């Protein structure tokens, strides 16, 4: 009752803040050509994924009040599909950003040649296709179930094999491999920063490179912190078949809520960790 409405209010606040902040980030990225660097394109893609994953929050939060899905089976399909599209899009975007930082730092000779914004858009498109390669089955195999109590939106499979195969594919191709790639790139970026006096020659350019790399690393760490609980909890609950309990339900709710809250948390990080973003967030809002 009181807890239910409190959770609904928290979800609504997170949802509205998420759409507002991510739409603002997208607009300030698309506003100016000086905001069209290789890193900014991937920031745009991450904000796009967050905005898509937040637009479905009011539908997901309304169900807590009646336990019924009156919106429609097509909306259930779209919501469930975006719920799986978000992870892949965001994590592959972060992996591409971290590899881009390595190309910039440890190979500056070919960095400007191979980090053309058109190339970055090509890599973003490749990210979208790779995300589709594991999201489209969820799009086709999601449908509403006309339960005796009320209509609910759940996934369907032909099921104990495919349901676990999808989870294994997500955990392998969407968490461990991108995290390892990011770690591998940064473990050499750090050494290249330490052992080299000047990266770009210009002190201002070197400072900008190091600051934007710090911001990228902080965003990556924030996403990792926000998304490890849900992936690990999903894997474990299937692995050892944790039975229903109050603590288990609270942990599940917290994991989902924080994974969704990351979408609204991102604009705070961009505002607090980049001078240009902070200036844009005040110029356009005034």
């Amino acid at each position: 009752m009181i807890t239910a409405i409190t959770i609904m209010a928290l979800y609504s606040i997170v949802c509205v803040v998420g759409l507002f902040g991510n739409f603002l980030v997208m607009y300030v990225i698309v506003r100016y050509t000086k905001m069209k660097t290789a890193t900014n394109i991937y920031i745009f893609n991450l904000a796009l994924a967050d905005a898509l994953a937040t637009s479905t929050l009011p539908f997901q939060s309304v169900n807590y009040l009646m336990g019924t899905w009156p919106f429609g089976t097509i909306l259930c399909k779209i919501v469930i599909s975006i719920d799986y599209y978000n992870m892949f899009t965001s994590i592959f975007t972060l992996c591409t950003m971290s590899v881009d930082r390595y190309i910039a730092v440890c190979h500056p000779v070919k960095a400007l040649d191979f980090r053309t914004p058109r190339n970055a858009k090509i890599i973003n498109v490749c990210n979208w296709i790779l995300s589709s390669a594991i999201g489209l089955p969820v799009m086709f195999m999601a449908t509403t179930k006309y339960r005796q109590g009320s209509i609910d939106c759940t996934l369907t499979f032909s099921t104990w094999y495919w349901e676990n195969l999808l989870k294994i594919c997500v955990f392998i191709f969407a968490f461990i491999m991108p995290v390892l790639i990011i770690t591998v790139c940064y473990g050499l970026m750090i050494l290249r920063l330490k052992s080299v006096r000047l990266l770009s020659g210009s002190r201002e350019k070197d400072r900008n490179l190091r600051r934007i790399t710090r911001m990228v690393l902080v965003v990556v760490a924030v996403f990792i912190v926000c998304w490890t609980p849900i992936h690990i909890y999903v894997i474990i609950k299937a692995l050892v078949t944790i039975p229903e309990t109050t603590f288990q339900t609270v942990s599940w709710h917290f994991c989902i809520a924080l994974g969704y809250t990351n979408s609204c948390l991102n604009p705070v990080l961009y505002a607090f960790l980049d001078e240009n973003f902070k200036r844009c967030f005040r110029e356009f809002c005034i």
Partner: nanobody
Amino acid sequence: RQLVESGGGLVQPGGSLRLSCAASFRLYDMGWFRQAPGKEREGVASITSGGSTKYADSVKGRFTISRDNAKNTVYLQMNSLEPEDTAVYYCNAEYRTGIWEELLDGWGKGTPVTVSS
């Protein structure tokens, strides 16, 4: 980070002095400069992290500057000192506040050297 200089004192002509500079993310360059009351600063030495050294025309053949990267301490051995080498010698170091920070220069307080007794 504070730059401390020492080793400066009254020395008879022809004596020897061991100058010292101490700095407490990574120190790449460290230099020395001399300044007379009626003269502008003239570069005397310049050493990198690798250890390559560059000297002034009059300084050459009498000044030896070497870097101890383990302690991040540089020292300048002063040889064949003449009264014309009476000035305040300064230690200048370039470093980075943090790994993600920019390159920044630092000026020492200066040590006074007088060759006469």
